[PDB]
Each structure stands twice: as structure tokens, then as C-alpha cells.
């Protein structure tokens, strides 16, 4: 039999089969409901659209995300998401397939327990397993040591691993990610008159971000370059027409990752939490960690982010070590790729949580050595 | 057939064949176990690393020494050490080779008896013999008289020998050695801010000691020189970067050998236990003993220790005798070299403890005239 | 003339006059700076708030600690702390008051040297003296022998003293303390759903710890009791309503003192380091040390710490001994009380360091006989 | 006026008044000095503890014996011992008391000369006298003939006396005694696992010896009995718990008196030096000497020593003699008892050395007919 | 054919060929045996060293003399001594050489009988003969009349001879000699603190005596001058150092020959036994005997002994007689010189005891006319 690999993430569902090179179903993790009245009798319209259909009916729906920061907040919505994923995108019967789920470090425990309970009671899968996103990223990267920085859409986290041993006291988790970058871009785009307030203009702003934003290698020099020239100013065409022109806020948006004070957060940038995780690890694995700094997740896809991260970590660490940043082109799907590798490993077929184990030990069996 | 020569020591295993000029397997006498959880499934990692592999995986393991001061405290660990030595470093079958083991004077008797029992029951050797480290050092030195000072890593001892007769009432044993010097250096390095607490930072401190420490010919003058100048201050580069600078504690560390009150011990320095052993011997061999003062073992490898020892013993002994200190460059391996010489001697092939003798007389046969 | 006793500690400054029964001024050693912009013109607000004031404006400020683990890292805001202590809490001119300050064992030398340089040049005190915290704790406890465990907020140490003589080779120092317990509690509350990330929320977590945590007498039985019953849950009220309930976390937090592997340290618990510091001492005084085990400092204030530690040390020591744990109710002020006693002795008035003494011998005079 | 009988011994001072039945003050002849630094200010530590106090503060002192083998090696320490004896134990003023002091045969002459110089100048006694220990033993035994074997703590000696005349050419002195037995017991316990190294553990070993050792009647049969049975082993309770169990070490320690080759001496046992002194004596008195063999001193106090020595001397002497060994229960104090008897004798009152005689003839007066 | 002349004596074997001016082999008559353990395998050490070889290894051996006072008390040792003398010092086959041996007057008969039995059965000489030592002294002196005083190392004797006739009733023998002088010097050296107890230190004391001792002309005046001045003090350097200073015991040692009460003997001095032998002779052969008083042997080698003995004998004898004392410089070897002369005499060749005479008459042939 084959196992499914559902990388829920927070803002993009990625599912597929264990043993493939890529997911076969990538769609947004949104659930939309109509907000207007509806006049044409016989239209027979539905009450809630899931996934990629909601993005077509944006102008009529209110789009809600069922996952805020890794954490699931709307369990009925999330159950709809899973039902859509199993039956409409993949077209499989979940009572014949083990399912490997992913989760971020340092989430509540009820999240994981309720996820297991759903997967066994509602969808009736034979086995299931919840994996950490950073470990799976390291599987897909081909390493066995290295400090991984998995910046998704809800959370950002560093997880240092050495020789296959993870150092839990050095795990860092930050709640700044692509969703906060989108909100900051919505906010600073009002300096030029453009206003995006609806829950469906957030998708337009996310598209603008993905297509035009980039990380500056030096922030003050790019500030001055934008103040003087106009060579970095680019245009974008809305779904309506009426092109908008983006100036220096092409690189002020992702700079929030290195200066979280822009959105009023207290914490330090990703370049500094990475270094603090290093310095919290031992002394005789720090050289390997410096040399194996692995990036994954969608928020690491900006142009120039690897070069910026290297410049910063190099200015932080001692001057005698080679600091190297691994940033594959298929970063966004690294967690899923690693999940497929892991679930196909023949050694892993004894780590599943079978259904009988659950029936006899309750949902608490998730936090056991299968953690 | 050939005999093996395993100089267990306390902190460095040295093994080889009888009839060679040097040991072919020198590795630390440590056994490491992982202390973190281990996340990558399929890693298939082991549960305990022995020898030189543990020093590579330092940052992940807890390193334990199975020999405290000559005495073996963890018999399972020591059995792992021996298994590694026989099968992985030397690649020999111990049921075809006699084995010569070494031990320090004035150890418990159960140490030696249990060692014999292990070597005959577990490893199944045909013969075995336990030798004293100082006697073997004197074999390797080419002498037949002389007072030998064998400062290893667990124990220090003087053993005066004259014309091949050892004087047991004049044997001295002190429990100050390289391990205590390492602990004292860890402690006094905190005066400059460097902190080494982990069981794997002790190895870094041992490296610092070996590479930078030296014995002062005069302690107050070097104290004043370090207080005034900076010409004796040297630097070292950790596995992490961040060089550390060592000042006057380059020579305060090995000065504990001549002033054991530094670590709160009651006893007297090595220069004074040597002289007390002399003065406890007869009156008409003291001139030869003064002239044949032999050093061996790793803790005698400091720069200037021979000159310091000579200055001290010369100030102690009467003014009309030539005091001479023999300190070969291959000091650290003298016990092993002498062991190889002894086991190759054709006269010695009748001093082995055969397996039938053991089977008929129990492990008590070790303390007989083969003592 | 009277002397000032300033037990600057690490996390609480306790000051007062020598000869009083308790410290007069007790406030957190915190320097806060505003992180937002400030709009109301005429507010005339200041740049940095110190001490107890900074906890009122805690929501606007970003709080720094000038002392990390006993050691002083930031010196400018430490001068700010001292200035606030002298002029705003005590209202005394330090030009006519000798000052007694405390420090933990096994600290850098530059700490003391800069401390006295500042106290003589910036504040112009006529005399000063730096004392060890454990000795003052023994003074206040009224013993003259006994092994004292002084768990503050940055550092934990054992100092065995017999008959008025301290045995420095048996002094242990551990960098696990109240701030590490606060960080572990922050990290462990996350699994229940609550997130505290800001330096202003670290103070709320410290309050939760102080008011709800306790040491379990039997850790496994308490874990089972929490996994079965619910009679352990207590509720706390955040500054904005939002009641939170904690179970396991009540005793899993201070258990880090007895199992430092919870926060990834390699060392042994406070009970085991106390026992090891006893076993480092001479065999004749271990009776009195076992019978006079003195606790002091804030981190020793959990309910059940004394009973737990007595149980542990009793199971470690031989069966013939009487183990006693001395834990006064005015425990967390013992260092200050002893400091006042000491500075109040007529025998002490010739052990200060004078102004001219310093002016002639430089700051190096701190380590010499005027200790 | 009454005289003072101070039998200073070597390892035990015994003092009192002439005319008593027993010494009033009995304490070890020990001077201790603190070896640690001392932190409690104001308690006013002193610099040297002498006597029974040094055994209470034993854990933090270095204990020195001012007298090595009968001979005094530290005159300042000995003056402290005598001052303590006169003022803090007997509470008498030596300006008004004659003092009888005791010495072993065949010591240096400067010993007696400096002893009397001190007693007349430092302490200003009105008279003094130096007696031989064996003669006083024979007084206290109620004999006037007999060969006395006085085994103290530094020196053993035989002094054959017949009819009140001593045979000086037959006096034998041996430098093996209780101190060498203690050192041998330390060195021989080390082979069972226990190690006592400090001068403060020498006292614990001496206590073990006194309390558990005995003399075997047949050494080979007791060795075989210990090798086969286990009925010989006793346990002892160290001053911190951790009982130790000793087997054949109980009778192997005092066997050094009969086989001084155990500690590398060449001489003959006490049973053989006794017989050799007898055979040096004239042929007409050997029968009386065989019949009056008197034991005294602390080292003659082992269980079974009288029976052993009778067996040995009987096997040595001709088979027609009555060998008889006189061993009173108050052996240890025989020298003091005899000294009291002698100083109370009325004939003795013109054999003191007066202050006038000393001021007249210098310290040389000690070796004159006023011996 | 040539005869061997072996003069054994008690403490110096000296042998050679008949017809030489001196012995070619002079060495001590000691047999040493190792008393320590022996650790170096392959050292191949022996079990007993004899002669001068045993003097180089004193620090390891226990030295025995096989001849106590003229009398041989260890026949195995004596056989070893003779074997060494024949084969290693002289290198001759004793089966082809007659052998002349010596002994003192008034020894047991079995000594002489067993001597010849050994020399015929074991060493298998063709002939042998035993001669009185004093007669051979008189041969070497070039006289045929005189009273000869032969002080060896175990025995002293006078033998008056007149015109070649020996007067057996006037022969005196005294058991005071160099060995007793060495023992007395060891005993009185302890007055200054030097102690020599080992059989190997007896040899150091013998060398001291030989090099420093002398006979005083007036004992009381020399004692007075030693008490007053310090011009008699002479220093000696032991095999190590601690040069010893010898005062009046330079001449108190050999004064035991003139006052044997010093070592507790009843007899009279050598001067008085010489005079008594004279007055024991005939009243017609006393003038020649007074005029031919011949000294020989090693104990007559002190500076001043001839003058002292002349003063004493002159004070004893009548005033009209001229006393003369013949003291050649080669006194120590006079017995050997005379033995060589006698054995080379052609008249003597009929006086040997042939092997056939022995075979037919038993060892009784030695006291017979074959003397
Ligand atoms: N090329 C890009 N540049 C910048 N941001 C991107 C890019 N592609 C995707 N993103 C951001 O990544 C986020 C999705 O990351 P993803 O890896 O899907 O995490 P998750 O699966 O947890 O949602 C989106 O919010 C989007 O804004
Ligand atoms: N060059 C050096 N200088 C100072 N110490 C050294 C040096 N080389 C080795 N050592 C010390 O010697 C010890 C090892 O001594 P060794 O002869 O191996 O004894 P053993 O074999 O009993 O461990 C180590 O603890 C190390 O600290
Ligand atoms: N009742 C309590 N229970 C547990 N911990 C406490 C309690 N009161 C204070 N503490 C802890 O003690 C620490 C302060 O200890 P303190 O004696 O002030 O050391 P310092 O003076 O070095 O700051 C604080 O971090 C706090 O968390
Ligand atoms: N019961 C005993 N058994 C064996 N040895 C003893 C006993 N009592 C005392 N001793 C030994 O006797 C010694 C003291 O002898 P002592 O008569 O005091 O001589 P001195 O007075 O010269 O010191 C001590 O070293 C002690 O070890
Ligand atoms: N120069 C000397 N002065 C004093 N005594 C001497 C001297 N030379 C030898 N002796 C003593 O003479 C003894 C040896 O005498 P020796 O003639 O050998 O007699 P024997 O041959 O019977 O042993 C030795 O004990 C030594 O002490």
C-alpha cells in the first residue's frame, strides 16, 4: 500500500503520495462563504467553497484561513479542507491509506491530539503520523546535520540538528511570516493612495508581494537609491486594470524579517535568531552548523535573501569560519519532499500509529516516542 | 606466535604487538553515549561510541572514563574498550595471542583479579601477565638501576630499582596527575571569563594544556614577569572560533605538580616524593639513584619539567653528588616500549600465566610469584 | 559613620545601612528604554527608566538586565542602577559612606576590578569591600561551619566552610538559576496554548512562577497524579483578565534544578553537586557538613525544596548520618543580613580598602589581602 | 613541695604529680597548624593548636609530631607541647616544682642537653632530672631484676637489669614501633580499596589499629584460616559512615614486630633481640632474666603478644628453662607509674639537678653522676 | 710444584703462592645474599655473592661472616669462600697444589679436623698443613725469640717463643678484636646522632674506624683536650654526604683494647695480658722477651699503639729492663709472609700431611705429629 503526505502548512495545502518527486495538489488553505444575498432562483449555489474554487469566486465570498500560526482555530473549516483534499484533488479513499501529517515545533498539544482524533474517527485512516517540518526539510536537503530555518506562512523556526540528533533546548520559534509581511505591505501601500481592505484584496496584495518584492543587500543604500533614482520602481496590473506603481516598498516589505520592529514586534531578525540558536548549541558542533545553514519554506523565496542572510551571519560569527547558506530552487516544497522520502523509508513502517494502538490508548498516544 | 602489549593506562589506550618499536593503536580511553533524543528515522545510530570516534561525536555524547586513578570503576565500559582495541584497531583474534597488561603499584587486588578473569573468560586469550609500569619504563630506558617517576594521567609513582631488585618499602604513589591538572586549568581559566563545564569541553581544555602549558624554572620570577610584561601571553583558537588568550596560567597549571596545595592536597611535590623515596632507600645505593632519575609518562612532557626537577632535587640532596635526570623524547610511550621488550624476551616465555594454570587455581593465581 | 550594604545580586538590588535588620530598598535590577516613538509634545519623557519605576511602564519599554550570570555585561546601565540606588532609593551621598558589595565565587577578575574602579572614581566612596555571598549567608544563619547552597537568579553555588575556614577546592558553581527556570517555564507553557515572548511578558511569567510553582517530593508520582486527577490545576489572572490554568507545569518547572537535562545541560542536580562538594572535603568534617546544610537565595524559596533536597541527600549519603537542611523563612535576604552583620563588626573596620590605598596600588588591590 | 613526672613519650604526653597512682593529663603530642585560608572575619583564629584540641580541629590542620624516634626534631613545637602541659592541662607553675623527665636509651646527647637547658631557662624549674624509661618500668613492675622490653611509639628497646645493676653493653635499641606499624597498616589497607593519605587520616588508621589488630599465635595457620574462612573479618566505622571491613590485615600489621622484613628492615624481631640481649648477659643471670621478662609501653598492648613472645623465646632458649612474660594490664603507663614512685622516694631527693648546679656547670651537668 | 698459602682469618681472606713477597688476592671473607624481591626478568641474577663482589652490592645483600672468633660457624659459606679463592681470585686447580692453612691457638679440634676433611675430600688437594698464626708472624719478623701479639679481626693472642721453642702454658687468647671495636664504634657514634644498623652500614663504620681512629698516649689528657679545644674533630664523607664530624671517639674506640671494661668484658688490656704472659714464662727467658715484643695483624695498625703499649709495659716491668716493641709497616700481612717463607723452606717438605696418610688414618692425623 501507499501512504499519503499532507503538508498542511498555514496558507497552502500540499498533498500527494509517498514516493513522488513533488505534490500533485497545491491549493490555498482557504474556505469562502458568500456574503451577498443571491437572487437567481435555480442557481442552486453551495454554501461554502474550499481551496482553489474560492479564489475564483473571491469577489463574492469572505475568505477565512483555518490556521492562524501553525495552530488550527476552526476545526470545522479544517475538516472541510481535508475532505476536499482527499476526495476532490487526490480522489482517494482515506480508509486505505496511511497519512503523514506535518506540524511546527512548539505548538499546543491539543492541536496534535485533535488532529489525530479527526484522522482516525472522521476519515478513518488505518495509520497516521505527525512529523516536524524542519526534520523533513533536512531529509529533502540531503544533509544529516545543519540548522534549518523553515519560514512558512504562519511561523518561522530554527531547528538545529547534528548527526540526526535534534537539540530541543536550542529550537527557536518566531511568529513572523508571510501573512505578517502581507499585512505590512497592505499597510505601507497606502502611502501612495492604493487601498486594499477587503479579505479578497489581501490575495491581490499577496500576489504583488510574490511577484515584485525582494530583499536588499544593504538597506540604507537601497533607501538612498530609491530616494534619488527611479530605476527600481516597477508596475503591476490589478484584476480591474488601473496599474499601480511600487517604489521603495519593494524591499521594505521583506525587510521586516530582518527588522521585526517595523511591525512593532520586540524580537530579533531571522539572521539573529539563527545565530542565537547556533550559540545556544554546543561548542564543537557550531562549525558544522555554520557550514550547513539550510533554508526552506515559501517566505525564503525572495530574491537576495540568501545573500543577505550570509552577509548578516558572517558579520555576526567569528571571522575564521566558512558560513554557507543552502537555498535550493525547490525550497517551497522541501517539507513535502522530505515527508515523501520519510514515509517511503522501509524503516519507517514501524513508526506509524496504527488504529488499534489508538483505540486502546486514546489520542494521548501521539506524544509518545512517536513525537 | 606473537604477544600483544596493551598499556591501558588511565586516559589513553596504547596497544600493539610484542617486538615493535611503537604502539600501532593510540586512542583515548573514553566511552560516549548520546544525550539528546535523535529525530531522523533510518539513521540507525549506535548506543555507545568508543575511542577515537567519541572524540569526533563529542558535541552529541557524554564522555566517561572507565579508569579513575589506575583503578577501573566501570567494568562494562572497560570491556567495551578492550573489545574495540582487539577487533577494530588491531584486527586480531585474542584467542591466539598472549596478552601483557600493565598496572600501577599499590592498586586494589580485585582490580588485577577481575582483569585476569575478564581476559580469560570473555576474550579467551591463551596466556596473560600483569606488569608494573615503572619496571617496564626502566626496561625501555636501557638502565638496570634508577628511580623512575611515572606520571601518567591517573596516578604518579616513584619506584626505586637497584641492579634489578625493587625496594617495595620505598615505593611512593600520589594521586595527582594530568586529570587533576586539567581540572585545575578549567577552574583557573574562569578568571578571564572563559567557562568550560561540559564533559566535552574538558577535552578542549586538555588540548590547551598540552599545547600551551610549561613549567617555570622559578615560580615567583615568572609570576612577576607575567605581572609586568606580556611577552609570555599566548593565544588559542577554539573549535568555534573566538580565540582565547592565556596569560600566567600557562605555568600555574603544571606548578600544581610541585605545589599540590594549589588543588588543596596535603602531600608534597613530585620533586620531594622522589627525594623521600631516595632517602627511604639504603645509604649505599643513593648515589646511583641520584644519578639515574628516570622520567616517563605523559605528564612529564611539559617544557622545562626536567630542568625544574633537577634544580629542586639538587637543592635538596647533599652538595657533593651529581644529580641527573633522564628524560627521553619518547617518554609518553616508555611503558609500552618496555612492555614490548619484556614480552619479546625469550626468558619471559616461562612467566606467562597459562590458561590451564588459571582453570585449576582460580583468579588468585595472579598474585603469586608472577606479581 | 555608617556603612552601606549593597547586595546587587542579579535580578534584585537590595540595599540598606549596615546595622539594620533588613534591606531598606529592594527593587529589580532592570533598565528600561522606550521602543515606540512618542507623539505627545510636552510629555518631556526621559530616555531610560531604572528599577521599580520601569516595571510600571513595562508595556512601553524594553527591559535589559545589566547582570547576566553574576557577571556584569553592561557597565553604563550598571552605573545607572547604582546611581538610582544611592540617590533615589536611599537618598545618601556616597562620599561619606563606606560601601560593602557582594559577588559570587569563581567570577572573572575584571568584574571586581571595574567594580572598585567605579566605586572609587565615579562615586568617590571613602572605602569599599567585596565579599563572597555564601560567607555572608553563613554569618546571617548564625553557624560557623556548614555547606551553604546559594541559589540566586543568575548563579547557584556551594561553598563548604568548616570552623571558619573555607575549602576553595570544593567550591562548586552552576549556571542554572531562577532566570533559566523562567525561560523553561515560558517554553513549557507554550504546549498548553499560552505564548509569552516579550521581555515584558517574561516578568509576568516570573510572577506566575513565584506564586504557583513548587517542588514535588516524588516526580514520577506527581506526574501520574497530574495525568489522572485534576486537583493540581490552579488558575492565574493575567494583567488584562484572561485567566490561565496550569497543571503539570507547576512542578515541572523547578524540577529543572534536580534534572538540569530538562534545559539541555550536562551537569547534575543541586542535590548531587552538594553531595559532591561534600565528598571533595576532608573525611573528618563531613559529619558537620551533612548536619549543617544551609539554603539561601531566592531560588530556594519553592515550597518543598527543603524536603526534596533532604530526601535526595539522605539517599546519597551513608545510612549512619543525620542530614539536616537549614532553610529559614527570611531565606532570600540572608546574603544582605549577613553583609550588614559583617560590616557592623568592630573587628572589620581595618579590613576595608581605603581611598589612598587604592590611589597608590591601582585597582589590582582588590584581589590582595584586602580581599 | 611535690615533683612533676612528665613522661613526654613520642606520640603521647603523660603528666601528673609524683605520688599519684596514674597520670593526670594524657593527650597526643601533636601540634596542628591551619592549612586553609579562613574567611569568617572576627572569629579570631589562632595559628597553632596543640594537644587534644588539634584532634578536634583535625580536619583542617596539618598535624606535626615534634618528636620522631625518641629524638626531638622541632624544639619550638616541643616548647609549645610543654607549655600546654604545664599551664593548660595541669594548671601549675613550673617555677615551684621539680620536674622528672624520661628518655630512651642510646639517644643523642644534645637531646638531653637542650632538654635541660629549656627546663631551666624557659620554664625556670627549681630542679630536674632525666631518667631511662626501662628502669622506671621495672620500678613500677615491682621487680629488681629482669629484662624489660619497652615498645613505645617511636623506639623499642631491651634493657637487662639484674639486682639493680644495668648491663649497658647488652642494651639493644630498635627503631621499629607503633608509628611504623601505622604506616604499614596504611600501605597494606590500600590493597583492599581504602586509601588514607593525609596526616589527619593517619589518626583514623591508628585508631583502626588499636581497635582491631592482634598478634597471631601461628602466622601461617592464621593466614590459611583467613584465606579459607571468613570468621576473621571485622568492620570499622569511619568518621563519616562507609564502614570498612578488614580481614587478614588485622594480624598482618603487628606481625611486623616479629618479621621486620615486612617494612624492609633487616633487623630481627623483638623476640630475637630479647634473646640476643639475654645471651649477651653473663651466664649466671640468664635464668633470672628468662624468668622476669617484662613488657611495657603502648605497642606491647596487642592481644596475643605475650603468648606469641613466650612461644618464640621458649623455642629459642634451652628446653630446661622457665620462660615467663610479665604483661600487666596497665602496661601503657608503666613508665609514668615508675617515674612517680622514683620521684617520691626519699632517697632520690639529693639526686635532682638543682638550678645552682646548672648555673655553675652549664648543661653538661646532665651526663655526670647526676645522670 | 708450588704450595698455596691461604691465611683465612676472621674477616679478610688473603692467599697466594709460596715464595712471593705478598699475597696476590686480598678480599673480605663475606658471603652476601639478596634480601629484596627481584623484578627484572632476564636479569639472570645469582643467589650468593662472595668476596669483593659482595662489597659492591652491599645495598642489596645481607652480609654474613662465616668465621666468628677464629672458629668457622658456617661450613657452606666457608666452602664457597675457598672455592672463590681457588678458582676466581687465584685461578689454580687445587688438585695439584699443596695448601698451607692457618688458625689461632686454642681453638676447637673439630674446626681443624673438618677443615682438613674439606680440603681433602671436596677440593682434593694433594697435601695440606695447618700452622699457628703467631709462629708465622715470628718467621716473617726475622726472629727466633720473642713474644708475639697477633691482634686479628676476631681473636687476639700472645704466644711467647724462645730459641724456637714455644711455651704452651703461657699462651693467652682474648676474644676482643677489630669486630668488637667496630661494634663499639657503632654504639658510641649514636651519641652524635649517626645511626648505622644494617650489616652494610657495619662496613661503612669499619672504613671510618680504619681511616680516622688512633690510640691516645694518655687517655685522660686526650679526653680533657677534646673537651676543651676542637682541634681533634675530623670529618668523613659517607657514600652520599652529610659529612659526619667525629670528636673524641676517634680515640675512645681503640682504647677498648686497653680497657676491655668499655664493652663489658672482665679481662685485662692487651698490655696487661702481654705482661702476664711474660711473668708466666720462665724467670730466665724474660729479658729477651721484653726486648722482642712483636706486633702483627690488622688491629695493631692504629697510629700510636706501639708507643702506648711501650709506655704501659714499661710502667709494669722492672725499671732495669729495656722494653722494645717491634711494629713493622707490613704488620697486616705478617702471618702470610711467614707462611710463604715456611712453605718454601726445603726442610718443611717432609712435614706436609699427604693424602695417603689421611686416607689411612682419618682426619685425626691433624693433631698428631703431623701437626
Ligand atoms: N516567490 C515568493 N516570494 C515571496 N514570498 C512568497 C513567494 N512564494 C510564496 N511566498 C509566500 O509564502 C507563503 C506560503 O508559504 P508556504 O511554504 O506555502 O507555507 P505554508 O505551506 O505553511 O503556507 C505565502 O504567504 C506567500 O506570501
Ligand atoms: N605535551 C604534553 N604536555 C603536557 N601534558 C601532556 C602532553 N601530552 C600528554 N599530556 C597529558 O598526559 C596525559 C596522558 O598521559 P599518558 O602517558 O597517556 O597516561 P595514561 O596512558 O595512563 O593515560 C593526558 O591527560 C595529557 O593531559
Ligand atoms: N517565592 C518564590 N518562589 C520561587 N522563586 C522565587 C520566589 N521569590 C523569588 N524567586 C526567584 O528568585 C530570583 C531572585 O533571587 P534573588 O535572591 O533576588 O537573587 P538576586 O539577588 O541575585 O537576584 C527571581 O528570579 C525569582 O524568580
Ligand atoms: N590497644 C592497643 N593496641 C595496639 N596498639 C596500641 C594500643 N594502644 C596504643 N597503641 C599504640 O601505642 C602507641 C603509643 O605508645 P605510648 O606508650 O604512648 O608511647 P609514647 O608514650 O612514647 O608515645 C600508639 O602509636 C598506638 O598506636
Ligand atoms: N689501618 C687500620 N687501622 C685500624 N684498624 C685496621 C686498619 N686496617 C685494618 N684494620 C682492622 O683490622 C681488621 C682486619 O684484620 P686482619 O689482619 O684482616 O685479621 P683477619 O685476617 O684475621 O681478619 C679489620 O676488622 C679492620 O677493622
UniProtKB/Swiss-Prot annotation, chains A, B, C, D, E:
PTM field: Oxidation of Met-40 and Met-43 by MICALs (MICAL1, MICAL2 or MICAL3) to form methionine sulfoxide promotes actin filament depolymerization. MICAL1 and MICAL2 produce the (R)-S-oxide form. The (R)-S-oxide form is reverted by MSRB1 and MSRB2, which promotes actin repolymerization. Monomethylation at Lys-80 (K86me1) regulates actin-myosin interaction and actomyosin-dependent processes. Demethylation by ALKBH4 is required for maintaining actomyosin dynamics supporting normal cleavage furrow ingression during cytokinesis and cell migration.
Signal sequence interval, chain numbering: none
Cystine pairs: none
One Pfam match: Actin
Sequence similarity: Belongs to the actin family.
Disease: Cardiomyopathy, dilated, 1R: A disorder characterized by ventricular dilation and impaired systolic function, resulting in congestive heart failure and arrhythmia. Patients are at risk of premature death.
Protein name per Swiss-Prot or TrEMBL: Actin, alpha cardiac muscle 1
Name of the gene encoding the protein in the UniProt record: ACTC1
Amino acid at each position: 500500500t501507499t501512504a499519503l503526505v499532507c503538508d498542511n502548512g498555514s496558507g497552502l495545502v500540499k498533498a500527494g503520495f509517498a514516493g513522488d518527486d513533488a505534490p500533485r495538489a497545491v491549493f490555498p488553505s482557504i474556505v469562502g462563504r458568500p456574503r451577498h444575498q443571491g437572487v437567481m432562483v435555480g442557481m442552486g449555489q453551495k454554501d461554502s467553497y474550499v481551496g482553489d474554487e474560492a479564489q475564483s469566486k473571491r469577489g463574492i465570498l469572505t475568505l477565512k484561513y483555518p490556521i492562524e500560526h501553525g495552530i488550527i482555530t476552526n476545526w470545522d473549516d479544517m475538516e472541510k479542507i481535508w475532505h476536499h483534499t482527499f476526495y476532490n484533488e487526490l480522489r482517494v479513499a482515506p480508509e486505505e491509506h496511511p497519512t503523514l501529517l506535518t506540524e511546527a515545533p512548539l505548538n499546543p498539544k491539543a492541536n496534535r491530539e485533535k488532529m489525530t482524533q479527526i484522522m482516525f474517527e472522521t476519515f478513518n485512516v488505518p495509520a497516521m503520523y505527525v512529523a516536524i517540518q524542519a526534520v523533513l526539510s533536512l531529509y529533502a536537503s540531503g544533509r544529516t546535520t545543519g540548522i534549518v530555518l523553515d519560514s512558512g506562512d504562519g511561523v518561522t523556526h530554527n531547528v538545529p540538528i547534528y548527526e540526526g540528533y535534534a537539540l530541543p533546548h536550542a529550537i527557536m520559534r518566531l511568529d513572523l511570516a508571510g501573512r505578517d509581511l502581507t499585512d505590512y505591505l497592505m499597510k505601507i501601500l497606502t502611502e501612495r493612495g492604493y487601498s486594499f481592505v477587503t479579505t479578497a484584496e489581501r490575495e491581490i496584495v499577496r500576489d504583488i508581494k510574490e511577484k515584485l518584492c525582494y530583499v536588499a543587500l544593504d538597506f540604507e543604500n537601497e533607501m538612498a537609491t530609491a530616494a534619488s533614482s527611479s530605476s527600481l520602481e516597477k508596475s503591476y496590473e490589478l484584476p480591474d486594470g488601473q496599474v499601480i506603481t511600487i517604489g521603495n516598498e519593494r524591499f521594505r516589505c521583506p525587510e521586516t524579517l530582518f527588522q521585526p520592529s517595523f511591525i512593532g514586534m520586540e524580537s530579533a531578525g531571522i539572521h539573529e535568531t539563527t545565530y542565537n540558536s547556533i550559540m545556544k548549541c554546543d561548542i564543537d558542533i557550531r562549525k558544522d552548523l555554520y557550514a550547513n545553514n539550510v533554508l526552506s519554506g515559501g517566505t525564503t523565496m525572495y530574491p537576495g535573501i540568501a545573500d543577505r542572510m550570509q552577509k548578516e551571519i558572517t558579520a555576526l560569527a567569528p571571522s575564521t569560519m566558512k558560513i554557507k547558506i543552502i537555498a535550493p530552487p525547490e525550497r517551497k516544497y522541501s517539507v513535502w519532499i522530505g515527508g515523501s522520502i520519510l514515509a517511503s523509508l522501509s524503516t519507517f513502517q514501524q513508526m506509524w500509529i496504527s488504529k488499534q494502538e489508538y483505540d486502546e490508548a486514546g489520542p494521548s498516544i501521539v506524544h509518545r516516542k512517536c513525537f
